Design a protein around this ligand. Structure first.
Ligand SMILES: CCCCCCCC
Lengths: 79, 89
């Protein structure tokens, strides 16, 4: 693992993928950067809408061993 | 700035709700699930992984692809009241 490129990155399990519902820890393979924002509609007119974004800080860790890997997880590969 | 939500650059797609993002937060504590909006600066792929053998000296993992169904939106009426935006690249 500590030699793969893009390296494997384990996302803090505060953020997981809900799949159908089971939730899975996330492993990232980032060939390009990713960003995550929470979005909330703050203005709702049929002619105009506004969305408030809030950046979500995501703690990750580069994996060195497979003993760190969960028993079930999703791998997201970004090109 | 783009003319319509159906032709943004990079493309905007709503991930079909069989796949959502679970964020633990907050009444009580627990996970809330959010629809995922993608801004597709680059392609992505999803694999389901399972550790099928948990022996220290002989571990094995099984990977199964997950088809990510996505939807092009026609108007902003299709944006949910709350969602997460994953921006690639
Ligand atoms: C924090 C990374 C989220 C992964 C998004 C997956 C979109 C199908």
């Amino acid at each position: 693992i500590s030699e793969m490129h893009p390296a494997l990155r384990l996302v803090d399990p505060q953020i997981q993928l809900a799949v159908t519902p089971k939730v899975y820890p996330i492993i990232l393979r980032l060939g390009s950067p990713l960003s995550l924002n929470m979005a909330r509609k703050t203005l709702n007119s049929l002619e105009d809408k506004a969305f408030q974004l809030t950046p979500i800080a995501v703690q990750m860790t580069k994996l060195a061993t497979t003993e760190e890997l969960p028993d079930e997880f999703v791998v997201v590969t970004v090109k």
